[PDB]
């Protein structure tokens, strides 16, 4: 079973270096990217390596 | 300089064990809780220990 799937909530690293919370809309295993929809309903392609369904709370 | 402040975006651990993204609306240093507003505009008091401005991506 895959780590990432449609409808899953994830954190995604954005180009500003920050983590935003979104939902996976499409998974592309050939390119290892997902289409992620964010809270403003924007949708962008994000590499699997920058998507995480889970996180460890902490300090920078 | 405090770790948490009004207007800050944070993850907060909910009673279901999951992390939700919200915004600090009030900081109470005597009780070490914050009033956190969530994406559905609900507001709850959360202990400082269960609030984090940062997260490390990771697997369960």
């Amino acid at each position: 079973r895959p780590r990432l799937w449609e409808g899953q909530d994830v954190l995604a690293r954005w180009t500003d270096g920050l983590l935003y919370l979104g939902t996976i809309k499409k998974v592309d295993s050939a390119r290892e990217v997902c289409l992620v929809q964010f809270e403003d309903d924007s949708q962008f392609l994000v590499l699997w390596k920058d998507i995480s369904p889970a996180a460890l709370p902490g300090e920078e | 300089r405090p770790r948490l402040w009004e207007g800050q975006d944070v993850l907060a651990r909910w009673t279901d064990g999951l992390l939700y993204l919200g915004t600090i609306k009030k900081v109470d240093s005597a009780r070490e809780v914050c009033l956190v507003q969530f994406e559905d505009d609900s507001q709850f008091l959360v202990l400082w220990k269960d609030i984090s401005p940062a997260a490390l991506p990771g697997e369960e």
Binding site: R13, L18, L19, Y20, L21, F38, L56, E60 | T23, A55
Partner: peptide, 8 residues
């Protein structure tokens, strides 16, 4: 750890 953010 990385700071989290909401869309502005």
């Amino acid at each position: 750890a990385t700071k989290v953010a909401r869309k502005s």
